[PDB]
Scaffold this active site. Structure first.
Site, mmCIF file in Angstrom:
data_model
loop_
_atom_site.group_PDB
_atom_site.id
_atom_site.type_symbol
_atom_site.label_atom_id
_atom_site.label_comp_id
_atom_site.label_asym_id
_atom_site.label_seq_id
_atom_site.Cartn_x
_atom_site.Cartn_y
_atom_site.Cartn_z
ATOM 1 C CE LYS A 1 -2.257 -1.590 3.664
ATOM 2 N NZ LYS A 1 -3.286 -2.087 4.624
ATOM 3 C CG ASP B 1 -6.818 -4.520 7.834
ATOM 4 O OD1 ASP B 1 -6.136 -5.546 7.567
ATOM 5 O OD2 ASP B 1 -6.992 -3.555 7.018
HETATM 6 O O1 LIG Z 1 -5.853 -3.311 4.783
HETATM 7 C C1 LIG Z 1 -6.222 -4.243 3.800
HETATM 8 C C2 LIG Z 1 -5.031 -5.117 3.435
HETATM 9 O O2 LIG Z 1 -4.127 -4.324 2.664
HETATM 10 C C3 LIG Z 1 -3.025 -5.065 2.154
HETATM 11 O O3 LIG Z 1 -3.510 -6.127 1.365
HETATM 12 C C4 LIG Z 1 -2.276 -5.666 3.350
HETATM 13 O O4 LIG Z 1 -1.178 -6.397 2.905
HETATM 14 C C5 LIG Z 1 -3.154 -6.579 4.202
HETATM 15 O O5 LIG Z 1 -2.415 -7.110 5.293
HETATM 16 C C6 LIG Z 1 -4.355 -5.776 4.656
HETATM 17 O O6 LIG Z 1 -5.243 -6.598 5.399
#
Ligand SMILES: OC[C@H]1O[C@H](O)[C@H](O)[C@@H](O)[C@@H]1O
Ligand SMILES: CCc1ncccc1Oc1cc(Sc2ccccn2)cnc1NC(=O)NC
EC number: 2.7.1.1
Length: 448
Positions: free
Chosen positions: A156, A192
């Site tokens: 991200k 999350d």
């Molecule tokens: O936040 C949503 C997701 O974003 C990315 O895919 C992260 O790698 C993952 O760990 C998280 O749960």
């Protein structure tokens, strides 16, 4: 119709989705098995959240959340309810994180976090107290236990040197220590998806899947312990963090990728990684539309072949613009205003074309996303005996929650793909805060 031919490239047929779904189930299987866990694009990370434990501590817990653009610190009270524990957020504060605190090292970053924690304690007559802390950390982690595991790599667009390969909980204890200010008992680190899943469990025992469609996109679900070869044991179930965002990273999605996807990928902070997520996540969705608009400009089909300076700069078409464009009632006021702000002066038909470009991209996100979830649900279906499997999915994220039609298209497409499953979708209330706290509560019963 020259426009429509370009946009139709975003289409996926039923058979395309079934192929993505089968391929996702195949990668989930490869991620769970010892022999293929290491080369697996879908990591299927054990989380140490289990179905087995009984008993939970009560009291006040601190919850941290890192992995939005904003970092959040909250207090949440856990107490004893019916068939389980209630939880409620009582106190909360959000903080931004500056550029130079993220261009730098991990040490620096976790110091900023520690500085933010103190601030929240100061402000809440709390500085003196010591509490069990739950850490929601939205990045791929290989866990050794509920309170220990290492960051595999940033996703991200997070940069921070010296984080990858290290115990993230260690990094935060080292920063609490280097502040002396306060004492905190880090009892649990969760993803999350897992936080969202857990927070929906109180009201719905059937909730066994957690999903995020926000800046990024990922899911977790309860797996049978015998299938989790990376943790010794066969007793009960453990939550697995699929990290399905990295699906496609081994070439599984090559036939579906568009020119716009290859361009988003090459320009991202993480070339060749998180390719499935780059089709869906809000970090990328506006940028995909932007690129589509540029192509239409270059073919002299939009804005009379003239793109403003703003339209030509990366990141200017924000994901929230995609949602606003699709909220337009038909009078084109919303669309006109967004484009005007971007230094364009669009005609009637320009506005309509921009609308279509948004729907093609967001509709493709919804459909792709549906195939991954269907794969997760049908895999779970195979281990279940009922005629109809009833399952609840907990969900959070601004793309899923706030985009006018995403959720509806996503629900219909998922349901098409999952025969003999009855699927209930629940949006979490403070999923991250409460979920971290509820896991902390249970871990405390033995750990602290
Ligand atoms: O936040 C949503 C997701 O974003 C990315 O895919 C992260 O790698 C993952 O760990 C998280 O749960
Ligand atoms: C969905 C997975 C699951 N199914 C059945 C039971 C437990 C359970 O896991 C937990 C639930 C909760 S909240 C909860 C727990 C019981 C009742 C009401 N609410 C907190 N931690 C864990 N697990 C842990 O391993 N905690 C460290």
């Amino acid at each position: 119709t020259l426009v429509e031919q370009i946009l139709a490239e975003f289409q996926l047929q039923e058979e395309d989705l079934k192929k993505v779904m089968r391929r996702m189930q195949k990668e989930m299987d490869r991620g769970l098995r010892l022999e293929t866990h290491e080369e697996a694009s879908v990591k299927m990370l054990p989380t140490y959240v289990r179905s087995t434990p009984e008993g939970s501590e009560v009291g006040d817990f601190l919850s941290l959340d890192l992995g939005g653009t904003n970092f959040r610190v909250m207090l949440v009270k856990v107490g004893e309810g019916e068939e389980g524990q209630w939880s409620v957020k009582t106190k909360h504060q959000m903080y931004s994180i500056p550029e130079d605190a993220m261009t730098g090292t991990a040490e620096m970053l976790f110091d900023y976090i520690s500085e933010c924690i103190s601030d929240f304690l100061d402000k809440h007559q709390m500085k003196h107290k010591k509490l069990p802390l739950g850490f929601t950390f939205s990045f791929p982690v290989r866990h050794e236990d509920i309170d220990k595991g290492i960051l595999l790599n940033w996703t991200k667009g997070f940069k921070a040197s010296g984080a990858e390969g290290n115990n993230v909980v260690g990094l935060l204890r080292d920063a609490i220590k280097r502040r002396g200010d306060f004492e905190m008992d880090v009892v649990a680190m969760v993803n999350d998806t897992v936080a969202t899943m857990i927070s929906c469990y109180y009201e719905d025992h059937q909730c066994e899947v957690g999903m995020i469609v926000g800046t990024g996109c990922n899911a977790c679900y309860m797996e049978e312990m015998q299938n989790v070869e990376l943790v010794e044991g066969d007793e009960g179930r453990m939550c697995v963090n699929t990290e399905w965002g990295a699906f496609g990273d081994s070439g599984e999605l090559d036939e579906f990728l568009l020119e716009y996807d290859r361009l988003v990928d090459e320009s991202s902070a993480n070339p060749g990684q998180q390719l499935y997520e780059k089709l869906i996540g809000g970090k990328y969705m506006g940028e995909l539309v932007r690129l589509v608009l540029l192509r239409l400009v270059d073919e002299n089909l939009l804005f009379h072949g003239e793109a403003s300076e703003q339209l030509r700069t990366r990141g200017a078409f924000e994901t929230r613009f995609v949602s606003q464009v699709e909220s337009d009632t038909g009078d084109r006021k919303q669309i006109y205003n967004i484009l005007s702000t971007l230094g364009l002066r669009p005609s009637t038909t320009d506005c309509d074309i921009v609308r279509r470009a948004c729907e093609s991209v967001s509709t493709r996100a919804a459909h792709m996303c549906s195939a991954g979830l269907a794969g997760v649900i049908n895999r779970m279906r195979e281990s279940r005996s009922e005629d109809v499997m009833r399952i609840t999915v907990g969900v959070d994220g601004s793309v899923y929650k706030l985009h006018p039609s995403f959720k509806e298209r996503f629900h219909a497409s998922v349901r098409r793909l999952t025969p003999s499953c009855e699927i209930t979708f629940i949006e979490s209330e403070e999923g991250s805060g409460r979920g971290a706290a509820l896991v902390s509560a249970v871990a405390c019963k033995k750990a602290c």
